[PDB]
């Protein structure tokens, strides 16, 4: 056809039918996107902007085979799902920080609601690492929702929703990384909180700018890119390449770590992530909180 929706589906390798607007189809699209479109911020670390507009995001993701951060990849996913015919809403959320022992002061997370024939879900392709849902989560307070990455749980209290996870044990064969700031040691992790108040993309613009410029922003502190695989997740942070295999053995995830040279990053970006940059990346591994 040459249509934009068909271009997007080609980008994510989705070759199936999209005529049934059901949970199976929604899940399949989510899965294809998270296995194709990385969660990344490498433009920041190449001296370029993180654009918020859909035309620019569609070009960079669909035509230039890039990914983006949540404000980008969920904006695109929102457009695609809506175009396909799903009943969609943009939502805003607040990300948990272990060191801060609280959720972000500002609304730094874009996620989606999809309503299908009497059930309500959240859908998010922009958490990445081992925080990334592989299926839509039903909006049912307190219910365990087991998935390949982990068991997720949504809880409602006083008009706020709280997304948490119960994580597996971790096997780290390269013990030179045991003390890495990248590792979440607890099996219980708060991910983010949000409300069901409908948003527009305009609501995220002030944060879109500030997250690119503030020395306080994790996004200026660490350069990263993440992509889900059929059984795990690849994530590069700074010069540190990781690969997690979910539930490799006995309720345990395996996490491989390797240090890359500057010269090795370009080939990894292409071969593992299908990322080809426009300019030279300056990899960074600053001190701000970001676990894999
Ligand atoms: Na909508």
From Swiss-Prot:
Phenotypic consequence of residue 119 to T: In allele NAT1*5
Residues that, per the record, bind substrate: 108-109
Keywords attached to this entry: Acetylation, Acyltransferase, Cytoplasm, Transferase
EC top class named in words: transferase
Family named by the database record: Belongs to the arylamine N-acetyltransferase family.
Descriptive protein name: Arylamine N-acetyltransferase 1
Lineage per the UniProt record: Eukaryota, Metazoa, Chordata, Craniata, Vertebrata
Outcome after substituting residue 263 to K: In allele NAT1*24
Gene Ontology biological-process entries: xenobiotic metabolic process
Originating species: Homo sapiens
Catalytic residues as annotated in Swiss-Prot or TrEMBL: 70, 109, 124
Biological role stated in the UniProt entry: Participates in the detoxification of a plethora of hydrazine and arylamine drugs. Catalyzes the N- or O-acetylation of various arylamine and heterocyclic amine substrates and is able to bioactivate several known carcinogens.
Localization annotation: Cytoplasm
């Amino acid at each position: 056809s040459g249509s934009d929706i068909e271009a997007y589906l080609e980008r994510i390798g989705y070759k199936k039918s999209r005529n049934k607007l059901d949970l199976e189809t929604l899940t399949d699209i989510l899965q294809h996107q998270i296995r194709a479109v990385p969660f990344e911020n490498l433009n920041i670390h190449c001296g370029d902007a993180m654009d918020l507009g859909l035309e620019a995001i569609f070009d960079q993701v669909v035509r230039r085979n890039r990914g983006g951060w949540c404000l980008q990849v969920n904006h695109l996913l929102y457009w695609a799902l809506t175009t396909i015919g799903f009943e969609t809403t943009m939502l805003g959320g607040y990300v948990y920080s272990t060191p801060a022992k609280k959720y972000s002061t500002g609304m730094i997370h874009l996620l989606l609601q999809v309503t299908i024939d009497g059930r309500n879900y959240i859908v998010d392709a922009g958490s990445g690492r081992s925080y990334q849902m592989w299926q839509p989560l039903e909006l049912i307070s307190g219910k365990d929702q087991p998935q390949v990455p982990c068991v997720f749980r949504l809880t409602e209290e006083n008009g706020f929703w709280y997304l948490d996870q119960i994580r597996r044990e971790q096997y780290i064969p390269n013990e030179e990384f045991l003390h890495s700031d990248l590792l979440e040691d607890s099996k219980y992790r708060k991910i983010y909180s949000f409300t069901l108040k409908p948003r527009t993309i305009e609501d995220f613009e002030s944060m879109n700018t500030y997250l690119q410029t503030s020395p306080s922003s994790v996004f200026t502190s660490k350069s990263f890119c993440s992509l889900q695989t059929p059984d795990g997740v690849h994530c590069l942070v700074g010069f540190t390449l990781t690969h997690r295999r979910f539930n490799y053995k006995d309720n345990t995830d395996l996490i491989e770590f390797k240090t890359l040279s500057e010269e090795e990053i370009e080939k990894v970006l292409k071969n593992i992530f299908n990322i080809s940059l426009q300019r030279k990346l300056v990899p960074k591994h600053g001190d701000r909180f970001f676990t894999i």
